[PDB]
Amino acid sequence: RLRYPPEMPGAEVKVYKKVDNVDLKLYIYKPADWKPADRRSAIVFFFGGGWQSGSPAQFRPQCEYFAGRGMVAMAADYRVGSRHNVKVADCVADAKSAIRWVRQHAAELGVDPQKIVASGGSAGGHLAACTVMVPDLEAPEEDHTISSQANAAILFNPVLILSREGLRERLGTEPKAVSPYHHIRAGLPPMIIFHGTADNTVPFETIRLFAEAMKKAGNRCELVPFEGAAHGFFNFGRGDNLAYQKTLELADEFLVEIGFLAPK
Ligand code: NA
Numbered sequence: 659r660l661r662y663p664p665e666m667p668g669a670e671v672k673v674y675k676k677v678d679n680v681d682l683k684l685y686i687y688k689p690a691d692w693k694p695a696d697r698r699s700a701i702v703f704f705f706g707g708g709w710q711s712g713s714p715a716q717f718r719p720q721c722e723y724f725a726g727r728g729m730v731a732m733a734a735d736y737r738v739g740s741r742h743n744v745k746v747a748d749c750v751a752d753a754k755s756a757i758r759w760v761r762q763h764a765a766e767l768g769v770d771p772q773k774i775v776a777s778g779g780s781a782g783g784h785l786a787a788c789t790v791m792v793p794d795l796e797a798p799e800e801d802h803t804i805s806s807q808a809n810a811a812i813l814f815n816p817v818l819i820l821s822r823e824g825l826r827e828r829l830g831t832e833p834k835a836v837s838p839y840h841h842i843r844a845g846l847p848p849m850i851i852f853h854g855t856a857d858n859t860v861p862f863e864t865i866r867l868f869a870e871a872m873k874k875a876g877n878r879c880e881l882v883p884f885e886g887a888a889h890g891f892f893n894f895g896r897g898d899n900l901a902y903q904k905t906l907e908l909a910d911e912f913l914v915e916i917g918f919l920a921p922k
């Protein structure tokens with residue numbers, strides 16, 4: 659199914675972070691007619707795997723699709739528990755480093771620094787959400803005057819509640835500090851969420867409750883239920899790629915809606 663290290667044919671490889679003698683890579687898919695002077699939107703995908711495993715190859719098909727639509731699309735590698743001595747808070751710092759790196763290098767990348775989308779599945783969906791709405795947890799030696807906050811998010815059955823407060827050994831902080839749900843506030847970037855109603859790993863009600871309170875704060879937060887679908891339904895190769903195909907179509911219309919992508 660998925661392998662690590664990933665095989666990423668045609669991708670440009672860039673090291674976005676060096677930490678603990680590990681070089682963390684972005685696998686970059688550029689569109690046709692790309693030039694550094696471009697101001698294209700960008701999307702950074704974070705794979706899932708419980709902050710313990712997974713592979714950047716997971717979102718390789720989606721990268722190819724969005725580069726084919728004119729986007730600078732990339733899949734980030736980030737540290738995980740089965741390979742590195744990290745906790746969830748470290749994964750968050752890596753995901754923020756990736757967004758900060760793309761913004762910092764927006765001119766070399768042909769990217770609009772205000773059109774960077776964070777995206778991910780399950781644990782990497784959590785990380786994407788952290789880069790839009792969870793404060794701090796930044797790499798301490800990076801230039802914090804470059805924002806690590808993404809400008810939109812596309813989430814594939816994300817984990818969004820990590821503390822049972824107001825309602826742990828692997829987190830690296832107090833639970834609330836890594837929990838997107840406990841940071842809902844007005845003025846947040848737009849996002850779309852795909853989630854299965856029969857998800858036994860991340861209960862759908864936790865996401866519906868999230869999106870409800872997100873709309874109350876005035877945020878554009880669309881939850882697309884996939885009736886009877888289970889955790890992971892969206893992945894390439896699952897079912898007959900019906901869910902993979904429709905999530906791409908729904909994500910495409912979301913990016914055109916907010917002005918990041920041109921209509922087909
Ligand atoms: Na290339």
